[PDB]
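ABC transporter ATP-binding/permease protein Rv1747 (Mycobacterium tuberculosis), 108 aa
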Amino acid sequence: GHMWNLATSMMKILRPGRLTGELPPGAVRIGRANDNDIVIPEVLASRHHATLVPTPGGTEIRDNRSINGTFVNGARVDAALLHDGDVVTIGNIDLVFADGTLARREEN
């Protein structure tokens, strides 16, 4: 179109993605890399494999079910609502869901 005489800026200033302390960001990414907060030490785990996000009605687990798959309580799912004490199988590892946090089962 025609030239307009309003000046532009070379850059925009925005909040950087710097998270600090022992505070989680409010969502958990499941995968193989240590950016994700919770990491499964598996060959069979993708770098981003599945996501945990909060919802107004609970917490969803949302899965890249396509190649290896995710099971919740023995059932293979694309997305599901989790509550505390649900058992999730990713990478042949049985994960235990408690209050937004996943842990491996171990007979301590």
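Residues 1-108 form one domain. The chain has one domain: 1-108. ok done for today
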